[PDB]
């Protein structure tokens, strides 16, 4: 657009810089300083995915501001949208596999303590990242972001396939959080119930209201509504603001609350 979309661009550049410094601190602390468990492997991979996504959002911010003020008319390449899509899908799939591993920890505690393979988690991590590549480049080369051209009749099909993948990740996160909540609300003795309940509803509403809108508008709404050309300048900058709020408040919730809280 013109000046109508300008203040979401400044908002995504403030929350993008906050997300870069948060995910940089989480990446440095879990890479080079602290001792890691399987959960720190999941938090580290989630911070890497959000670091890639917020890097590509802040360079989209910078090329839009270079288009507006300096009038350079720089063109970012088309594969940055592809690797940003891969970062977004991996950053949501880490949230789903965090909720699945917590459900397996509470429902099956003897197995999760004593018989869990220590090289499971990273293996699960790399397979989810592998599937992110299988949903990114097979997206992008059909949508013209790779190989300069592509059939849109296939591109819409692969957008619907990854939309089914996003609603599958949401029902896996919601079903696992529901199973963990009924397992604690039936059978808890010494657990901190209200803090655990509030953090579970916080992570579910972050995955619903913040992480999911950009994927639903980018892969699903844009093909099924068929008149979204005037709906763009309202729904798309607020969706990248909400997804950058998801990627920026994933270091603060999953690390600096779980593990940097007392200080």
């Amino acid at each position: 657009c013109g000046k109508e979309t300008l203040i979401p661009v400044f908002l995504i550049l403030f929350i993008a810089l906050v997300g870069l410094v948060g995910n940089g601190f989480v990446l440095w602390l879990l890479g080079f300083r602290m001792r890691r468990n399987a959960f720190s492997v999941y938090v580290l991979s989630l911070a890497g995915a959000d670091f890639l996504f917020l890097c590509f959002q802040i360079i989209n911010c910078l090329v839009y501001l270079s288009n507006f003020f300096c009038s350079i008319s720089i063109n970012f390449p088309s594969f940055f949208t592809t690797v940003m899509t891969c970062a977004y899908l991996a950053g949501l799939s880490m949230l789903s596999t965090v909720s699945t591993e917590r459900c397996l920890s509470v429902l099956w505690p003897i197995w999760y303590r004593c018989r869990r393979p220590r090289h499971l988690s990273a293996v699960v991590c790399v397979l989810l990242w592998a599937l992110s590549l299988l949903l990114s480049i097979l997206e992008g080369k059909f949508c013209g972001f790779l190989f300069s051209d592509g059939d849109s009749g296939w591109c819409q099909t692969f957008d619907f396939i990854t939309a089914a993948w996003l609603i599958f990740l949401f029902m896996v996160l919601c079903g696992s959080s529901l199973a963990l909540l009924v397992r604690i609300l039936c059978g808890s003795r010494g657990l901190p119930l209200t803090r655990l309940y509030l953090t579970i509803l916080l992570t579910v509403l972050v995955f619903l209201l913040c992480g999911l809108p950009f994927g639903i508008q980018w892969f699903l709404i844009l093909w099924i509504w068929k008149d979204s050309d005037v709906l763009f300048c309202h729904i798309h900058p607020v969706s990248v603001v909400l997804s950058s709020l998801n990627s920026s408040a994933n270091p603060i919730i999953y690390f600096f609350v779980g593990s940097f809280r007392k200080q």
Binding site: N60, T81, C143, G144, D149, G150, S152, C155, W218, L222, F232, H236
Partner: peptide, 5 residues
């Protein structure tokens, strides 16, 4: 080629 940017 698709476009919403």
């Amino acid at each position: 080629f698709r476009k919403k940017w």
